[model samples]
Target: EVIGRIHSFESCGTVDGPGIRFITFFQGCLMRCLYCHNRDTWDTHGGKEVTVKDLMKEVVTYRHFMNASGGGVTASGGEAILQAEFVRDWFRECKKEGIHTCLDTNGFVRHYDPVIDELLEVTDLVMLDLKQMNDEIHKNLVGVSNHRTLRFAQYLAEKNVKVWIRYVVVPGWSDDDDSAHRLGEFTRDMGNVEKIELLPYHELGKHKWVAMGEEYKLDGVEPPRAETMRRVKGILEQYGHKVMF
Candidate 1:
């Protein structure tokens, strides 16, 4: 009886996970990221409802592409964890087929429950989005508490789950030395973290807000300079954290 509000599907996503993955974008999200690329996925009621069996019809077709290249299925969102039962069911099925499972989330967890833990049990790799380390700024930028995200990070570490930390570099928000230092120091001893990805913020998602008739607060803010990026990367690297584009 489990089902998910699905936004869309990408059959051969390369960047979302280890290999060619079937990325499922589940509908609804609790956070309002100012520069979200998937802003249209915010509505809880939006998107087509589909069962795991329905998805498997197509998901299984690309099994050769997935298994051959060390890729599988990724449960992405608008915070896919929002539908824990559905995702867990889907991942369980994927596991049965010997497909690797990955999860991409904003790390927003007010409280972790059993349902979420069950989903995590099937997840092979987790790509957790780290928006901002500063609590107040984090809330203002994404409409959520950094405490929740950070707590979720800690919980993943406690669970001994392998994770990839993706920090979006935004001008005047999270690109500064302090933020970089804090990030480095925070994950210095986390053995579970496989890599720390540095994603530069871009205006590509601005049009999504504009098309929706909402004001894009980061209207004229430009991408951070290369010099700044180097500095930030250097800071993180100083603490021995591997950074990537």
Candidate 2:
């Protein structure tokens, strides 16, 4: 009977996970990334509360569509792990229904905890966002240290969890060749990393910052060019990691 604070839900999401996924955008987050699109979801108390059964009622209805596309459910955030107990319960039910479960996280949470461990146990795939390879730059961009995120990545590798490394290539902040190469080199030895996705940074969420009365720091920043993405993808591929667009 665990109730979760949920921001919203997307019935058909192709990019968040494999095939067509039912994405749950849970409420709450610790890190405040400068270029986050879902700025409105940051407030922990902003979302509606619903029990696991409440969501499953709607989720189960989409089973046919999900199974046809080899997709299932994904728990995205505002830091979904903030509500680990809730997600753990939801995912457990998902498994019971023969549905795939994916976790799209910033990897900032402590995954060593029993609650998080239990959640990972039921997770079929993990889309981990590795914001910045440089700790100093990461802290400046996301208002937190990258220590926990890096450790979480290592933990996943040790646990043999299937992981898809996601990186947002912001034009000025994270588009450096050296940073790309560094990230590639770091993740090169992770045997559990199945794919690496380089997402081009966009200003689609700039309006949300204005609505929240927060300054959109990267106001004039444009999306990374196709050439830049190709270059970064090539860099990652050189280090023995397969890059997926």
Candidate 3:
């Protein structure tokens, strides 16, 4: 009878994970990143709630595609870890059904020590978004220090959890060569990292801010240049990472 407060669900989302994915966007988040695409999903209790069993029914319908394409359910956020108990139960069901489960998160909340251990048991991959390497900058971007974020990364790495490290290359905030290099170095030390992605910052989410009646900072900020992305990719590859588009 487990259920989750989900913001929305996408039936066929390719960018959320490998192959075609049934992506569940969970409600709420702890971080308030300036460039959040889903600004409307920030409130923890803002979305319709669904029980875990109901979600499993929908997830099961895609079992055939999941098995054939090596894709399954991805529980994304507004920081999914905010609902640790629900996620644990949901992922447990996914595992029982032999589905590959991936958690897309900001990696802010650590919860109890055993929670992560239990979660790792059922999770196949973690799509971790590292917002910033600098503590102050990270706090400014996400409203929390990078302490827990980095701790989560290290702990996951220690347990040999497969992770896809994602960096949204924000033009003025995170697109600097030094910033990319530092991040590359961090990813290089983790053996369980499966992929590194430099997601270029874009303005597609700008309308969400207006819709939500929030001030949109970085209004004039443009996406990074093509060459800058290439150079950043090179920096990450230099750290022995397999860069992905």
Candidate 4:
């Protein structure tokens, strides 16, 4: 029996994926993004344990609502890829019930892992968060190289997995037009990119940091302005990637 350590579940999540979604926030993540809203989800040891069967039982209860809204299950994280095998089994079960499966991931895990490959096989859509196109800036922000992420993106393209590119517009870190344009160019040739979402960074998780006895690095940084988001959106649009806020 495959069990997943899940941080939480949202019955009707509007922002995580298409329409209204049943979002499972899986626990654990490798990357430490400075602006992570769910700061508490970083610890791999945290979250409640539930077997795949139990999870699917709950998921099926919302099948009617999911079908009515053109929404389904979204396995999000602290990087859902961290629990690849569990997700693989869960998604497989979801498929058995004819549910649309989406994986909201940072794409930092080992792509060659058979379990990961299996997980992607059943995934209907991927919400791939591309933190930064530049490797140095990426490391400074998330404490890991962007090489693996970019490689994973290419792998998705090869597998023809539909992807919705998600980029957080942090005021200082990722708001530059040049980098946005670079990101646009990088994703322009990808055949499977379905859409691009520019999520404005916020300090909503500062309190979580406070409770966790950690200093929130972007304490005083404000969310990006509407104008900044517009500019960034425009850049990606110029590259022919469908833009969404």
Candidate 3 deviant stretches above 4 angstroms: 13-19
Candidate 4 stretches with Cα past 4 Å from truth are 13-19
Q: In candidate 1, what are the lDDT values of residues 57-141, reduced to their tens digit?
A: 8899888778746788899978898898999999999999999899999888766789888989999999998888877888888
Screening candidate 2 with a backbone cut-off below 3 angstroms (N, C-alpha, C), the clashing residue pairs are none
TM-score of each: 0.95, 0.96, 0.94, 0.95
lDDT (C-alpha) at residue 111 in model 1: 64
Q: Write the per-residue lDDT of candidate 3 for residues 1-245, one digit (tens) a residue.
A: 65679898876846554556888899998788888998988898689889988898888877777864667888896888887778888999888888889899888875656776787788888999988887777877777788888889998899999999999988888888888888888878999999898899998878989987889887999999998899889888899989976
RMSD to the true structure for each prediction, in A, is 1.7, 1.7, 1.8, 1.7
The reply for model 2, stretches above 4 Å from the true place, is 13-19
Give the better candidate number (1 or 3) by lDDT: 1
Clashing pairs in 1: none
Model 1 residue 129 lDDT score: 89
Better of 1 and 4 by lDDT: 4
